[PDB]
Amino acid sequence: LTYFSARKGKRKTVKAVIDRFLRLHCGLWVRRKAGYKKKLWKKTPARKKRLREFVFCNKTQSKLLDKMTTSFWKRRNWYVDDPYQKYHDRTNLKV
Amino acid sequence: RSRAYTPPEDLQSRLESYVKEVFLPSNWQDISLEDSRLKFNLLAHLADDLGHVVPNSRLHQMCRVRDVLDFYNVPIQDRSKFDELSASNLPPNLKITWSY
Amino acid sequence: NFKRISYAKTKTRAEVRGGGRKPWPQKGTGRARHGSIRSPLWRGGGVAHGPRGPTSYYYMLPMKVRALGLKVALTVKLAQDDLHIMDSLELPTGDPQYLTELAHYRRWGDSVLLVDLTHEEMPQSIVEATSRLKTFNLIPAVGLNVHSMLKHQTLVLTLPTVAFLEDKLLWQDSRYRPLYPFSLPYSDFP
Amino acid sequence: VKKGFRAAFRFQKELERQRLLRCPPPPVRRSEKPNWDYHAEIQAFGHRLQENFSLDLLKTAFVNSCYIKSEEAKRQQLKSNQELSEQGTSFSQTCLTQFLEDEYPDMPTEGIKNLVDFLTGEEVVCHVARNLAVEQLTLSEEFPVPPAVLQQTFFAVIGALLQSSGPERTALFIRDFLITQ
Amino acid sequence: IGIRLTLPPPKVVDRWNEKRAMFGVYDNIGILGNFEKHPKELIRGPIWLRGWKGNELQRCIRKRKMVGSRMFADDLHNLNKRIRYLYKHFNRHGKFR
Amino acid sequence: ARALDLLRGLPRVSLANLKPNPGSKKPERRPRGRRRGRKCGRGHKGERQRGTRPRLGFEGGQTPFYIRIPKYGFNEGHSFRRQYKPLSLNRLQYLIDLGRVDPSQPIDLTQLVNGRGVTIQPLKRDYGVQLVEEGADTFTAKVNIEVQLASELAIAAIEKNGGVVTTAFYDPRSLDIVCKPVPFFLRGQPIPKRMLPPEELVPYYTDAKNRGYLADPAKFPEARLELARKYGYILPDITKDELFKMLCTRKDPRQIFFGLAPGWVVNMADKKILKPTDENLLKYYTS
Amino acid sequence: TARGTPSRFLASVLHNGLGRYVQQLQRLSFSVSRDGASSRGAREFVEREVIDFARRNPGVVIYVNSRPCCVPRVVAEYLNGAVREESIHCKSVEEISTLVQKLADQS
Amino acid sequence: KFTRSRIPEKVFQASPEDHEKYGGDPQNPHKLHIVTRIKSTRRRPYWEKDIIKMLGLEKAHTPQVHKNIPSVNAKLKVVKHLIRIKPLKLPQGLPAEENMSNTCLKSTGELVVQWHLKPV
Amino acid sequence: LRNRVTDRYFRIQEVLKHARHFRGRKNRCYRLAVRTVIRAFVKCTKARYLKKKNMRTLWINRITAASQEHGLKYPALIGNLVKCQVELNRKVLADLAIYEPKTFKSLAALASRRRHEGFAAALGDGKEPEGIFSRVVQYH
Amino acid sequence: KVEGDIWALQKDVEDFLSPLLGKTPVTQVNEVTGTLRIKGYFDQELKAWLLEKGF
RNA sequence: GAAAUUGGGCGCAAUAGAUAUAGUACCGCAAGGGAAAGAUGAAAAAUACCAAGCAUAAUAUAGCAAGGACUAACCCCUAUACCUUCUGAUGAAUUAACUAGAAAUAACUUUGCAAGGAGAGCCAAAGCUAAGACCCCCGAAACCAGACGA
Ligand SMILES: [Mg+2]
Ligand SMILES: [Mg+2]
Ligand SMILES: [Mg+2]
Ligand SMILES: [Mg+2]
Ligand SMILES: [Mg+2]
Ligand SMILES: [Mg+2]
Ligand SMILES: [Mg+2]
Ligand SMILES: [Mg+2]
Ligand SMILES: [Mg+2]
Ligand SMILES: [Mg+2]
Ligand SMILES: [Mg+2]
């Protein structure tokens, strides 16, 4: 990525990352599964039910996605009728 | 004007005399110095007399008369270290010079 | 360090003069491969990681840490028995030697920081006496800092400066987080 | 010109050391160098050997007769040494012959005289008194202290220990410094 | 032998100079002069770094946009090449990423 | 304290005595010596010692993780979605108890900013405060709040205690003037008129069930009556008590500040208000 | 190394244990700055330990010179005329006491 | 492949000739082993290095006391080529708190609870 | 040069005081003197083990020579003095061999006497009285 | 904001929390700043406890 | 990668710093490249000791040149030069001087304040602010633009 831009001297986000992923404020990145709209005629319905799911990311995938975006994207977002808003704070962890 | 202090032997009666002259009951050693005029007159008389003044670093520490009494009977003795070493009864094989 | 700006700049290997073509070819000579006579190995070449430009070392501590540092300097000067409080800085005469004799008699120190409330209302006699002295310095109460409280052995306040410092430093305790800068108007601040 | 001061100071003192090794000065006596208190160091010479002296008498044991004469040569612009050294060398000769007659009864007395004239020779007594700080306390004319003078001061110190504390303690002194040679 | 033989002339330092005795004054002009000035308005220097701290690429970017139109011609050219180098260095070279 | 009493016996604090708090200053590690530099941290000569390891996310040639994955619009319209900072009723009872928000006055958004109870930032497109039902039980306050969104249970918790809720609307310009009003009256502009909601939100603010500021004052007792029946409290009438004249005051739409009017120019310096009397300006500002 | 250094045979000074034992240390010469941060532990050594030390062996004559030094030194002189000059630079009082007793104990 | 070696049980069954050779009794055996590492664990498998670390035998030629129980004997059967085992025999009793400090384990294998330094 | 190095004569001279006795340019030039001075210090520490070793074989040569003067061999002498609980070591036996050859002759007589009691004891096998010098002093 | 003797406060907090743990809680006084730092969340218990004490 | 909107020196000090004592000497047909270096003193109307290199002072059986030693320099014994690249050939006569790790997102450590922090903007389900602490040197063939050249 760009660590220091030529105009501002700031970090830049990779906009592929924003266009594909969802940062929950606890640090978990949500994605869609690859191939969830491809060749559905040859996929068993258990597999089609698996592909239509919102799948969390790895630890290193998560830290890789944190480094590829900036602090605007890491921010509390108090939307109106957000569907994912009950998934932001992390309930009841014992680390 | 030299910072040596040697506390007097009649200091109980002098200090008590000043406490009466700023005022007076028995148990006069437990009189609170919460009034600020009373403290200024008492310590101003003692500083005028004894030549030894309560410093700023200690001035809030005396809240009773007994604390001023406990202040004015520490010997603050002030001289150079050449005069402290050479007066500390050196053995005959210590020789101390001060190239100053 | 916040006011500090280093004017040290050197020339890199691109800014130093000349050195645009290879000095000798790549292979045929038995000398070392070089690409310019201005690379950082050459007598006359650029500096590889030297100082670059004016650099400013600016940082602000939070204003509560600066204000607490002024407090801590005041309690330390009072606890070491170096605070002295006057009622006004009005001298009976304007000579310097009176003031050095006074500071020598009361066993103050080598160097005295006199602090009055404003720069306009400093009395003429202390201005004429301390404007000549190297170690006895008049400062307004706005000018009070921590480097020059520690640089000076004694510090001399007047009672209006003491009420000033209590007002300006007990304000930082029990004040809200700012909505906007305090130079702007507020309900109760000036 | 590299800026700075500490390498120039260290280099300045190493140059001073090579100046002292290339051309060393002639050795000055110790009383003409700093850190000398003569009286304190006579008392230290007393307590060093583990005995007591009458300090004035030991002081005259270190004062030669050449020193008074060149001193009065310096006045024009003190008891001597010789009585104590006479008593000390008379005593140490007879007590060394006591020890060496007792522990070697079969020796000829020519051999006891050559042993005793070894243990009071200039080589032995001058080797002993340069390691007991006698030479540093000798008031002599010239430096280094010439060996006949220092022999005289050493037996003056024996005479002063004799008049101080009797014949038995000097017998232990002579035993512990002259016989162990 | 790159070491000097005579020790240098002495460094007379006047600690009670005008500048040293009055160093640090008006660092607290904000917090006890009713916040009318900021202390960053006390520092004097280049106009592009009065009250600003950055690394070198940011000092060069800010120098170019704040004073670069009236810079000299080959100084402006050297500075554009420095931003072009320091760009290609910070963004493509290093150990941590 | 024993500690200043220690400072009596110690030498004076100078610029030669100071030392950082141990733990503050890690030492700089720099590549000289047997351990910090021979290879100097980079390892053996490859591409990571030369300095030229490729960009973040390059997996060496296979298609990267962050590109094997379908683009889905999680963040599709993110910067035009509206945000509303929560204000719980536990928070607002907390502000009322500590004197920070006066409940004997109307509680507009300016009064929650000046008591610093709620920080909203109009850039990063917060459109205001939403009331939050947290702390509805143990909320004991008669209050008059103007909050841009409100859940039904938070309206019920206020209106049980003798309160009045209304939901106003603010433009980002208007909300920005509302939050920090004093840096607007140093801007020299006349007070603007706040705009009506967009088409998404007109059906919100014209409904009496969620207490819209554009709704009827003839349909409100039906909705207050309905929540009082739903959540089981007998609806007190605001008309009886003495704060009623306070609990009725609303600023109309197209009014940003409370006692002021659009088009006025507040002169903060000599404490005046310049008011326009030209008819074209009065047609424009009272529209 | 041993081939670069000179060597010697183990000896005494004047058969130092045979008849009696003689303390081989004549003079110590401390030089201590009055104002100076390197001779702090020397200062607290003269104030605390040098009188006790000077009483524990009276055949040693001790000179505390107390000039403006920038490095403080101790200069031990021995009965056979050797001089060991060691520094007490930036040392604690306990480290100076073990050094001075080290110089006392040796020859 | 070089693998871990099980050892069959007939290897660990004494014969009365061995009771005549060594000094053992099959009825009423000894309680405590003395184990001593006498052959390095280097150039040995990592499991034997571990068993030497568990038994407390990282120093060579230093005795260690163990129990004569089948678990400790199982670990000792893993590393029986690196160690030496003797029975801890005790001529007098086990040491009470009076004789706790004045013991000495002799080289015979016995642990004497009064260790004077005087000849008999 | 902001801060270039002033104090470099002394780093060189810390190495070169160890090389003042070498040959060739190793006593002079720092690049050569460092390799030889390091290499001399490595030898200087590995030679502690060889000092101990070579003293011990020197002592075995001296004990071997002096015990061959009395007919014994070295293994006979050392073995049968261990067997007498004479726990002298090699340093002491070599120094007695040089400086006190009567004590060494009597130790050779004690070791050959014990050697013959070992022969006659391990010849007439069975229960017999032990030799006189064959007895051991039990320590408990 | 602990002003005074922090070691009495460490004794009394450590006597208060050890029935809620079994063991003594592992703490750290910072006598310079005047803080006291306990391991594990005990915020509501110490706020209630310090309201009982009168602070 | 926008916009609305907002509002003298903790420099160098003669291999450094300018290439600069000079765009000179020199090199090139030309465009163009491009040096090096000075040190007395108040007065010249007062004429030390230290790099490598040698010399004073050539050499003596045997061997990475040393180490253990030793009465003794050598003789005795021990000892497969250093860097770098490989699992285990490269470069260096030698001295002096010059010559290569630059970024504070997140985490950590230390303070301040704390449901708030921050000297507007920003973050906040114990956070925020401040600081400390992490990211090298040299080296092609080339490509392009504009000149100078028969
Ligand atoms: Mg170029
Ligand atoms: Mg190139
Ligand atoms: Mg240059
Ligand atoms: Mg703009
Ligand atoms: Mg130059
Ligand atoms: Mg040049
Ligand atoms: Mg030379
Ligand atoms: Mg050989
Ligand atoms: Mg070659
Ligand atoms: Mg070099
Ligand atoms: Mg032609």
Side-chain angles (χ1 to χ4, degrees), chain A residues 44-83:
Chain A
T44 181
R47 184 178 174 184
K48 289 153 69 172
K49 167 63 167 61
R50 290 193 293 266
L51 289 170
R52 290 181 283 109
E53 287 184 356
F54 283 143
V55 156
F56 288 108
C57 291
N58 204 354
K59 175 176 172 178
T60 62
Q61 289 171 354
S62 176
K63 306 306 192 301
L64 187 272
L65 295 172
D66 283 330
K67 295 181 190 293
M68 274 172 164
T69 60
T70 59
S71 300
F72 176 77
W73 299 98
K74 269 77 163 177
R75 164 237 154 77
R76 297 295 305 183
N77 287 317
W78 291 107
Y79 291 146
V80 278
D81 295 325
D82 187 69

Side-chain angles (χ1 to χ4, degrees), chain B residues 1-4 55-57 78, chain C residues 78-79 81 83-84 105-107:
Chain B
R1 183 65 62 189
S2 64
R3 288 182 182 274
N56 285 320
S57 60
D78 197 7
Chain C
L78 179 61
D81 196 3
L83 193 77
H84 300 285
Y105 172 71
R106 298 179 178 178
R107 286 181 174 177

Side-chain angles (χ1 to χ4, degrees), chain J:
Chain J
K1 301 288 277 182
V2 180
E3 179 165 2
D5 186 78
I6 309 101
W7 293 95
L9 186 269
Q10 196 248 338
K11 184 178 179 180
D12 298 332
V13 166
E14 187 173 0
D15 285 330
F16 171 73
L17 295 174
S18 59
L20 306 178
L21 297 173
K23 59 182 184 294
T24 66
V26 43
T27 72
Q28 167 192 357
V29 315
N30 192 356
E31 194 184 2
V32 181
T33 69
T35 67
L36 181 125
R37 189 185 294 272
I38 311 151
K39 185 169 169 183
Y41 292 154
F42 304 107
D43 54 342
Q44 298 297 108
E45 292 161 345
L46 288 167
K47 283 185 178 182
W49 182 67
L50 286 172
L51 287 176
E52 293 172 359
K53 303 295 291 301
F55 301 119

Side-chain angles (χ1 to χ4, degrees), chain F residues 1-283:
Chain F
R2 299 185 185 183
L4 302 166
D5 299 337
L6 283 175
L7 286 180
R8 291 191 193 95
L10 268 62
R12 77 177 73 250
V13 176
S14 60
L15 300 166
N17 290 112
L18 298 173
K19 186 250 289 180
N21 202 354
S24 309
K25 266 66 191 297
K26 293 177 69 179
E28 179 180 4
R29 303 293 178 188
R30 56 172 320 213
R32 276 89 172 95
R34 192 175 74 83
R35 188 250 184 261
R36 291 314 192 289
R38 173 260 196 100
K39 298 286 190 181
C40 297
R42 308 294 285 265
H44 300 301
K45 294 174 184 171
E47 199 173 3
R48 71 265 212 100
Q49 171 166 355
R50 265 64 171 266
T52 325
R53 274 192 285 174
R55 63 181 176 271
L56 191 61
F58 187 68
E59 300 188 5
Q62 71 177 0
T63 45
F65 169 71
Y66 75 107
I67 276 174
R68 298 181 68 89
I69 294 168
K71 285 189 172 179
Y72 185 74
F74 296 104
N75 298 306
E76 188 179 4
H78 73 87
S79 63
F80 307 116
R81 305 175 193 167
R82 298 177 182 91
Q83 299 183 2
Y84 289 95
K85 289 285 185 181
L87 159 131
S88 61
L89 291 166
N90 199 354
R91 175 65 164 170
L92 182 134
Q93 183 66 47
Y94 168 75
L95 298 169
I96 286 169
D97 289 334
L98 275 71
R100 288 168 55 176
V101 174
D102 185 80
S104 295
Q105 289 304 113
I107 311 302
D108 197 63
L109 196 145
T110 72
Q111 307 301 319
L112 297 176
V113 175
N114 296 330
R116 295 168 182 85
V118 172
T119 299
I120 60 167
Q121 47 194 356
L123 301 313
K124 308 293 184 297
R125 72 286 309 160
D126 291 329
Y127 281 18
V129 182
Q130 57 166 345
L131 269 167
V132 149
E133 78 273 11
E134 173 180 354
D137 45 352
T138 66
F139 173 73
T140 310
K142 179 178 287 188
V143 74
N144 189 0
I145 325 174
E146 193 85 31
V147 173
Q148 287 84 28
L149 299 185
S151 64
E152 290 177 351
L153 202 146
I155 305 172
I158 292 166
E159 285 183 344
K160 173 181 176 183
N161 298 311
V164 177
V165 198
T166 39
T167 62
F169 179 74
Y170 291 104
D171 307 325
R173 175 176 172 83
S174 173
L175 193 276
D176 186 76
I177 296 162
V178 163
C179 296
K180 296 181 287 292
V182 182
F184 177 78
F185 304 124
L186 304 178
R187 187 172 292 135
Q189 299 170 355
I191 297 170
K193 53 184 183 179
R194 57 170 173 167
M195 300 314 299
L196 296 177
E199 295 84 359
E200 299 94 4
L201 294 171
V202 173
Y204 190 86
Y205 295 101
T206 55
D207 289 343
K209 289 184 179 177
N210 52 18
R211 264 67 165 182
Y213 79 118
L214 297 169
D216 286 342
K219 291 187 179 180
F220 281 179
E222 294 172 350
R224 298 181 65 248
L225 192 275
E226 280 182 351
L227 288 182
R229 288 179 177 180
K230 178 176 177 177
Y231 291 103
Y233 59 92
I234 295 172
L235 194 274
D237 53 348
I238 303 168
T239 313
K240 281 185 182 294
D241 59 345
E242 288 83 6
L243 277 303
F244 172 70
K245 190 177 288 185
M246 189 274 290
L247 293 179
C248 185
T249 59
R250 296 173 194 173
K251 52 187 180 182
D252 58 343
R254 304 162 79 91
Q255 188 186 0
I256 289 175
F257 291 107
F258 201 76
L260 297 89
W264 295 2
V265 177
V266 174
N267 193 7
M268 292 286 287
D270 56 357
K271 298 176 182 177
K272 289 180 182 178
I273 290 169
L274 309 176
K275 299 195 279 190
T277 56
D278 181 74
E279 288 186 354
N280 291 321
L281 301 176
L282 288 175
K283 290 184 180 179

Side-chain angles (χ1 to χ4, degrees), chain I residues 16-31:
Chain I
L16 299 182
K17 63 183 175 183
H18 302 289
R20 298 285 84 178
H21 62 96
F22 290 175
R23 285 191 52 172
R25 307 186 191 86
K26 310 174 187 69
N27 51 7
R28 292 186 293 266
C29 304
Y30 179 78
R31 177 187 300 265

Side-chain angles (χ1 to χ4, degrees), chain C residues 2-3 5 7 12 14-15 52-58 60 63 66-67 70 111 134-135 137-148 151-152 164-165 168 171-172 182-183 189, chain E residues 14-17 20-36 38-40 42-46 48-54 56 59-60 63 78-79 81-82:
Chain C
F2 86 98
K3 282 188 291 183
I5 293 175
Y7 295 101
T12 188
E15 300 176 2
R52 294 300 310 171
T55 66
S56 71
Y57 295 20
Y58 173 79
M60 275 292 115
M63 73 168 71
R66 271 96 52 94
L70 288 176
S111 58
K134 284 188 176 178
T135 56
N137 310 125
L138 270 180
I139 280 181
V142 187
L144 183 59
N145 49 341
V146 169
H147 184 277
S148 69
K151 182 172 170 64
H152 296 99
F164 181 79
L165 288 175
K168 295 292 191 293
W171 179 75
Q172 294 285 335
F182 300 105
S183 61
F189 176 64
Chain E
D14 201 3
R15 302 288 171 183
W16 296 104
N17 195 0
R20 282 168 190 151
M22 310 313 293
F23 180 79
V25 191
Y26 313 117
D27 287 333
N28 297 120
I29 188 166
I31 67 174
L32 73 156
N34 293 116
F35 300 91
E36 296 177 355
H38 205 281
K40 76 189 175 182
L42 272 291
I43 76 171
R44 298 173 66 87
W48 66 92
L49 44 90
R50 284 172 177 164
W52 186 81
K53 185 185 178 70
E56 187 190 357
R59 284 183 273 120
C60 290
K63 174 167 171 56
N78 283 318
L79 179 135
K81 294 201 292 181
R82 185 97 262 255

